[PDB]
Design a protein around this ligand. Structure first.
Ligand SMILES: [Zn+2]
Length: 353
DNA sequence: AAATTGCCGAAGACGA
DNA sequence: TCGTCTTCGGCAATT
C-alpha cells in the first residue's frame, strides 16, 4: 500500500549529520590510501571510482557501508575470454613501457600477484592511521580485495580494477537494453566510456570479470525517459523508491533468516540488476508515477520472483551471464526466498513493520 | 609531462 | 511546499 510504503521509505531516509560524519571518515582514509598507492611504480596510474548504493543515493537506514574502486589506467589490454563464461577473461598486453609487467606470468596478467601487492600496501598504510582495521575480504574471488572497518562502525569495500578504454567486449553487444527507455543516443554514449576488469575467480585461474559500476551509477542518477525526470517536485518518479524498498525487503529477510544460511548469497547487486530489467520493461516515466508506488513496487517484486523461479537473472550488461545459475546459487536457496517473498506480499510485508 | 586542485551545481536531507 | 545546506562527479587551471 502506497501509504505503508511511504512510511517505510521515511524511516529509511539517511540522516544528513550521519552522512557528513561517515563521509568525512571514509574520504580521509581513502585519500590516505590513494596518496600512498600513487607513490608506487606498479600503482602509478591509480584513480578513484566511487560505486554502489551510497554513491547512487539508494543506501537505506544508515550510511555505514561504502564501495570504492581503485582503478588503474593501463596500456591497451588484449582480452581472452575464459572458457565460454562471457564475463571472465585473461588479461594480456599488446613490457618495458608498462608498469604492470612485474605481474606477468608469461603473457598473462596475474590477478593474484597484483592482489597480493595491493593488499600488502594497503595493510601497511592502515597501520599508519587510527581507528581503522583491514580485513582481507574472505575469498570473494578477490573483489573486493580488502574490507576496512573505520572506528568499528563504517565498512569500506575496496576493489582493485583495470580500466580499459577499448570497445566493450563482444559479450556486451546485446546488453544494456536501454534504447526505448534512455534512448539509442544515450546507449551509444555510455558504450564509448571505459569498462573495468576486477580480479575474480570463475568456478579458478587468473581471471578478471567485467564491471560497469560507473554506468550503473550514471543510469541511476539520470534515470528517466524525460530529461527532467525528478529535477522538479512535479516530476518525481518512484524508481529509486522502488529500488530502496526491494533492497530493504532483501535486507530484512536476510536478517530474519540469518540462522538458516539459505539467503546468504543474495546481494544488493541482484536486486539492482533485477530493478534495471524492470526499468527496461517499463520505460516510460508515467509507469513510475509516485501515486503508483504500490503498483510499481509490485512489478519489482513480481519480476524478482520470476527470476528466482526460472533460475535466471541476466547481468544487465552481459546477457549470457546468469547471476542466478545453479552453479552460483543453490536451487533450494532460490526456492526458500520465493516462498518468503510470496508470504510477505500476501501479508502486506510484515517484515517491513 | 601529467597528476593535483578548487570550483560548479545537481541531488537529497531538513526545518520554516 | 519552499529555501538552505552538504556532498560528490567532472575538469580547466594549476603546478
Ligand atoms: Zn525520476
Amino acid at each position: 500500500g502506497a501509504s505503508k510504503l511511504r512510511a517505510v521509505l521515511e524511516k529509511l531516509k539517511l540522516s544528513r549529520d550521519d552522512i557528513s560524519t561517515a563521509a568525512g571518515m571514509v574520504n580521509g582514509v581513502v585519500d590516505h590510501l590513494l596518496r600512498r598507492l600513487k607513490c608506487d611504480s606498479a600503482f602509478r596510474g591509480v584513480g578513484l571510482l566511487n560505486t554502489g548504493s551510497y554513491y547512487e543515493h539508494v543506501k537505506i537506514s544508515a550510511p555505514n557501508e561504502f564501495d570504492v574502486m581503485f582503478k588503474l589506467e593501463v596500456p591497451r589490454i588484449q582480452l581472452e575470454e575464459y572458457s565460454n563464461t562471457r564475463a571472465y577473461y585473461f588479461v594480456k598486453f599488446k613490457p618495458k613501457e608498462n608498469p604492470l609487467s612485474q605481474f606477468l606470468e608469461g603473457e598473462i596478467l596475474s590477478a593474484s600477484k597484483m592482489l597480493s601487492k595491493f593488499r600488502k600496501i594497503i595493510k601497511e598504510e592502515i597501520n599508519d592511521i587510527k581507528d581503522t582495521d583491514v580485513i582481507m575480504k574472505r575469498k570473494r574471488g578477490g573483489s573486493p580485495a580488502v574490507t576496512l572497518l573505520i572506528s568499528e562502525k563504517i565498512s569500506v569495500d575496496i576493489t582493485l580494477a583495470l580500466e580499459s578504454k577499448s570497445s566493450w567486449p563482444a559479450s556486451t553487444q546485446e546488453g544494456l537494453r536501454i534504447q526505448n527507455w534512455l534512448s539509442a543516443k544515450v546507449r551509444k554514449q555510455l558504450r564509448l566510456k571505459p569498462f573495468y576488469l576486477v580480479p575474480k575467480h570463475a568456478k579458478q585461474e587468473e581471471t578478471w570479470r567485467l564491471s560497469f559500476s560507473h554506468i550503473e551509477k550514471e543510469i541511476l542518477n539520470n534515470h528517466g525517459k524525460s530529461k527532467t525526470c525528478c529535477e522538479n517536485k512535479e516530476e518525481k518518479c518512484c524508481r529509486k523508491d522502488c529500488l530502496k524498498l526491494m533492497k530493504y525487503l532483501l535486507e530484512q529477510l536476510k536478517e530474519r533468516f540469518k540462522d538458516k544460511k539459505h539467503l546468504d548469497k543474495f546481494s544488493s547487486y541482484h536486486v539492482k540488476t533485477a530493478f534495471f530489467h524492470v526499468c527496461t520493461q517499463n520505460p516510460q516515466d508515467s509507469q513510475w508515477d509516485r501515486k503508483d508506488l504500490g503498483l510499481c513496487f509490485d512489478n519489482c517484486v513480481t519480476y524478482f520472483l520470476q527470476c528466482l523461479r526460472t533460475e535466471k537473472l541476466e547481468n544487465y550488461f552481459i546477457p549470457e551471464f546468469n547471476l542466478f545459475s545453479s552453479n552460483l546459487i543453490d536451487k533450494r536457496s532460490k526456492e526458500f526466498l520465493t516462498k518468503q517473498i510470496e508470504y510477505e506480499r500476501n501479508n502486506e510485508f510484515p517484515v517491513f513493520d
